[PDB]
Structures are given as structure tokens and as C-alpha cells.
A = this chain, B = another copy of it.
Amino acid sequence: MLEQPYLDLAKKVLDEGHFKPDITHTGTYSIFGHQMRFDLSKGFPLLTTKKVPFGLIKSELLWFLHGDTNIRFLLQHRNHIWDEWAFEKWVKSDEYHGPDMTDFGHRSQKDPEFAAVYHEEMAKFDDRVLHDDAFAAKYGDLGLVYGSQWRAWHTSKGDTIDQLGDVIEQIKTHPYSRTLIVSAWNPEDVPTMALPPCHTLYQFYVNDGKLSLQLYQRSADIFLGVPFNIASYALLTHLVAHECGLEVGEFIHTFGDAHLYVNHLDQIKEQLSRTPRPAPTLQLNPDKHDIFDFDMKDIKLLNYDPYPAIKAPVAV
């Protein structure tokens, strides 16, 4: 089965990952240096042993594609993946007139009462971003995110580089180029960033008219993050291949530090007892080919019949 590589990764970490403590000491078992590969000709690698909200990866990807870095687009599609990073700034500012909200993501978990005040301040925030263009342009704009790194890489000459756009062009004119790389790691920004890019860089490759992609991920949460990550870049490979008129190749996922948070031990073990089902099939709108102008309705997934969703504590 297609998802086997991910299940194998889980096993290896379980019985070979060594205990390493991270910033918050949730605790992790980890390995360093790993590579899985998925053949997109067999099916889309969306985990079947656990339901994964594809809508969330579809809108988040489009968000990056448009070179957007403003939360508003996400909220318009009910995608609250990036909220806390934006909300963080709204709290740590001059106009914020409310409860402390300091260490919210942590205090909430350790307090069923704070989880409510925080839940509301967040709700109000999301609303203001959704209707106050000025508030949106100020607290909704994340600035340095994948959308701007991929498509608005700032140069020392005050200009902007559309890395993705250019590479898709180089794919069409120079298919056998060994320099078809998009990077999200900028040394001058990384040391100030709240969250330096996890998905450091990716390289495209063409052969026999098939397009493959390799992704180097410097850090990965195996239980929570990876299932989203696999689908995201498997989707990109399909889209970029749609625009370039190529047939799908392989998705190679390379890992630096792949870890399993000690608090997700039983959820993963449970998932492992599950037997994979046949993979779903993706279907991209044939009439539209400018992937930059793609919409939610343009990407269609089929025959995805997963197991129940597993609930786990987002380590922090």
C-alpha cells in the first residue's frame, strides 16, 4: 500500500528513535536522516489509516500558490491553521486592550477557564480580520511565510524574485535542468523568525515525461505534521505537472530531524494496528491549466474512505 512508508517511519522511530528533549520538553523520540518515496501513479498518498482534512491542505496550498501571506484568505475558507501566529502579534501590541494572553497556547491546556477567555479573544480577532481591511492588513499579514518566500523572495536590491514562477518556466524550457530548486531558507531572516521554515527546500526533476519532486524537511512531527505534509507536496507535484503538461512521477520526502512527541505514543500505536485501505485518486480540472489561478473546486479527490480520526494533544 502507498502509505506504508509512513507506517514504517512510525515503527522505526518507536523502536529506534532516541529520547531527545526539545524546547518545551513535551519529549520526543527521534531519528535524523530519513527518506520515503511515493509513486503518484499508484494513487494520492493521503493517509487512509486515519482521516485527514484534505480541505485544509487544499486551501493552505492555494494560499501559498497565490503568494498570499495574509490570514484572511484562510479564514474565508474556515482554515485556522495559521491563526495563533497572527493572533500572537495582535496580543503583543499597543492596541490590545484585554486579558494578558501571555503563553496562551500553554496556559489554555493547563486551564479550562483560560481556554475560554483565550478562545473568545481569538474569535473576536478572527472576526476583525474578516471585516476590518485595516486590521487585516496589519495583524492578518504574516509577512514571511511560504507564499512570500516561494513567490516574493526579497533581494538586496529592493526587488522581488518569483522562485516558483521562474522554476515552472525553467521546467517547460529546460526539463532536464538539475537546478530546478525552490528554497524557503533565507539566512538573514531565519534568526529573527518566530518559526523558521520547516519545509526548507524542494527540487523538481523530469524524466520520461514524468515529473518528480524531492522535499527536504529539517523537522517533522510524525504523528501530527507528516500526514498533512505528505499530501501538501504530493498535491504540488500534481499541480506543477498539470501546468507543465507532464505526467506524474514520484514524491520523495527527505527528513532531517523526524520526531514523535512522547504524548502521541498510544495514538500512533493504535493507528499502527490499522490495516491500510486503497488510496484515493486526485482529479484536477482539465480546462484550467494556470495553477496560480486555481480554486478549491478545481481540485477534486476521489474514493477516500479513511478510518476514524485519531485525537492527540498538540505538543507545546
Give A residues with C-beta under 8 Å from B.
1, 4, 51, 66-68, 70, 72-73, 76, 133-134, 136-137, 140-141, 151-152, 160, 162, 165, 266-267, 269-270, 273-278, 288, 290, 292-293, 295, 305-311
Q: What residue in chain B is nearest A7 (Cβ atoms)?
A: B133
Which residue of B165, B290, B307 contacts A66 across the interface (Cβ within 8 Å)? B307
> Considering the chains assembled together, what is the distance between the CA atoms of A270 and B165 in angstroms?
16
> Considering the chains assembled together, what is the distance between the CA atoms of A72 and B307 in angstroms?
15
Q: Which chain B residues lie closer than 8 Å to A277 at the CB level? A: 137, 141
Q: What residue in chain B is nearest A277 (Cβ atoms)?
A: B137
B4 with A276: CB separation less than 8 A: no
A308 with B134: CB separation less than 8 A: no
Which residue of B70, B76, B276 contacts A133 across the interface (Cβ within 8 Å)? B276
9 A-B Cβ contacts within 8 A?
Answer: A1-B133, A68-B275, A70-B274, A76-B273, A133-B276, A152-B305, A152-B307, A266-B288, A269-B293
B137 with A308: CB separation less than 8 A: no
Kindly provide the distance from the CB of A279 to the nearest chain B CB, expressed in whole angstroms: 10
> Considering the chains assembled together, what is the distance between the CA atoms of A307 and B143 in angstroms?
11
Instruction: Given the known inter-chain contacts A133-B275, A273-B73, please indicate yes or no for A308 contacting B152, CB distance below 8 A.
Output: yes
B137 with A66: CB separation less than 8 A: no
Which residue of B136, B162, B165 contacts A275 across the interface (Cβ within 8 Å)? B136
Q: What residue in chain B is nearest A77 (Cβ atoms)?
A: B273
